[PDB]
Amino acid sequence: ACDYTCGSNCYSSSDVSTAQAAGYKLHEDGETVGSNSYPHKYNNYEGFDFSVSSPYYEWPILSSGDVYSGGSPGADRVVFNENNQLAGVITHTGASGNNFVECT
Ligand SMILES: Nc1nc2c(ncn2[C@@H]2O[C@H](COP(=O)(O)O)[C@@H](OP(=O)(O)O)[C@H]2O)c(=O)[nH]1
């Protein structure tokens, strides 16, 4: 089993660890990367009832195992907060518009 599933994108929690971690170091340095420049705040326009406390942050997770390093965000994503606490795994895949659904 994969700790989180976004459609067909199965991901172990370890994977999850190395994505948010990465994205949090870039958040620390205050640096931004990407056309859609990640990391950036994720406002919760969808409103999932999260354990973690806002302010939350959008950051891409690739199914290939590597970290976001510019380019393609793909469609799945990890959201941390200011104290690197994990709020979740949301994905475009399966919802409509530019929605995100939590990854089971
Ligand atoms: N679906 C969604 N997209 C978000 C959220 N927060 C940011 N984004 C996306 O990231 C883009 C870049 O981050 P931004 O929110 O800082 O601009 C946003 O432009 P928008 O603000 O117009 O939504 C939006 O398209 C959110 O809570 N939900």
Per domain, the residue ranges of the chain are 1-104
> What gap in Å lies between CA 93 and CA 81, rounded to an integer?
23
**Resolution for this PDB entry, in angstroms:** 3.2
Q: How far is CA 9 from CA 1, 2, 3, 15, in A?
A: 12, 9, 11, 12
Top mutation candidate among 27, 38, 45, 92 for ligand 1, by most atoms within 8 Å of CB:
45
- Closest atom, ligand 1, to C-alpha of 100: 1
Asked if 102 is an active-site residue, the reply is no
Please work out whether the CB of residue 96 comes within 6 Å of at least one atom of ligand 1. Answer: no
Residue 71 in tokens: 């380019």
Asked if 27 is an active-site residue, the reply is no
DSSP state of 60: E
Experimental method: X-ray
Tell me the CATH class for 1-104.
Answer: alpha beta
